[PDB]
Each structure stands twice: as structure tokens, then as C-alpha cells.
RNA sequence: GCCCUUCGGGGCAUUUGGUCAAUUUGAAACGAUACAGAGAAGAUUAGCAUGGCCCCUGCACUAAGGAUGACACGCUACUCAAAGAGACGCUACCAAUU
């Protein structure tokens, strides 16, 4: 099957975040003469998100050897469809990547983040994620489990 | 596509490239607010330097300035004795008012 756009690009036009400054900075793309406490509470809720059955498809990049997968199809934000040069598929097993670089094609690192977010470091070879901010009931594990199961192989 | 042909064939032209167009999690920085708060053995302070895993402004990486730009002010045995003079040191502990 060809893979389907998630979302459209009406959507997905390039725009300015919202002014928490007095001026916009060009040069880093950022808003100044504001303050720093709204920076560290602001995380908002994801766009979107994608699925196995009815997004994950064939593309471009299932024709060319030895690509990459697609970081927003991940993100379930790629309006690109068929036309992505990425895949749009959960890797496999038999899926493996240098320690350089990580399965979007994104430059590995010597170190991490100090909040341990990002790319990752090829100076250890983890595989576990640390998913906090969770709602504390009594169905937290099977919710979990649904979930990541769902996302790969545990 | 064009050209040539001796109608079999042959020629002309030949491998681009900038990680996507997507801002939370691969790195911008002030200001406001809070607080404190300026060297030289009494008080007040003209400065010029020194050293670099501290830099800023500047064309100056052969000026100048930035509080003399700041930092400096903790800590503190270790190449290490000798002479002569002592030692109930190294064991025991001991029998009359009238």
C-alpha cells in the first residue's frame, strides 16, 4: 500500500511560535525581552500521532536502498504521504544502524543532554527510554504495556 | 531526438545534490525582580602592570577602555637531627600509744 499523509500541509505551513517577547530575533529564530519561568513550565501536548495499519506504508525510500526512517512520520506529523524520501515503518529486527547516526538519520553524539533528551550518545548503547509525567492509577502498567507494545519489541 | 550510412550499421549528448519546507528534547541573550555590594597595613583614592582552562567593547591578533576590567587575600609536618643530663625505667613494697 502507498503510505497516506497524516496530516495536510494547511497545517503544516512554516510560521513563527507564539510572541512571549518584546522583539523576534532573527538570527536564532527566538523571542527576546521576556522572561525565563514560561520557557521552563511551556510543554505542550503532541499534534499528532501515527499507526502501524492505517499510516505506515510504501515510499520513495522503500525504492531506494539503505535510507532512513522518517522522523515525522514517528512524530505522526508527516504530511508527505507517498513522497517522503523516508520510511514510514517501525523498524524490525533485522533493522540496525551504525553507532554514528540513529534510525531518523540524525547525528549520534559523544555525550548526552543533560536532561537526557534528544538524539543519544553512541558512547553507550542504550535501549531504554524513561517515560515520566505519568497519571498515578492502578492500570498504569497495562496501559503501558498496550502502548510501547504497540510502539516496537520489548 | 537529430544526423550519417557501404542499408549491415555507426554517430551526437553522460551520473545533480545544500540532512527534508516541520522551532517542545542537541543547546541565543538581556532586561525586570530579588538580593547584596567598589584596591593599596587610619580616612578618601590617580593609576600602570603581572599570570591564563576569565573574558567583554574595539579594525587594532603590535591602540585604548572595561572598578587600576575582574580573579589574587585560602592553605601551611615530611631531603631533617645531634650532643649530655636525668629516669623505685626493666623489681619489690617492709613489726607499739602506756
Known sequence: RPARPQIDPALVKSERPPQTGTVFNIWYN?????????????????????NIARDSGYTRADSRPGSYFCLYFARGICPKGQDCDYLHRLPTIHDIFNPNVDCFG????????DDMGGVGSFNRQNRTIYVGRIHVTDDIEEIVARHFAEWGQI
Open 30 to 50: 527566538k523571542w527576546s525581552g521576556g522572561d525565563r519561568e514560561d520557557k521552563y513550565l511551556s510543554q505542550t501536548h503532541a499534534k499528532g500521532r501515527c
Open 106 to 113: 540524525r547525528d549520534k553524539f559523544a555525550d548526552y543532554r
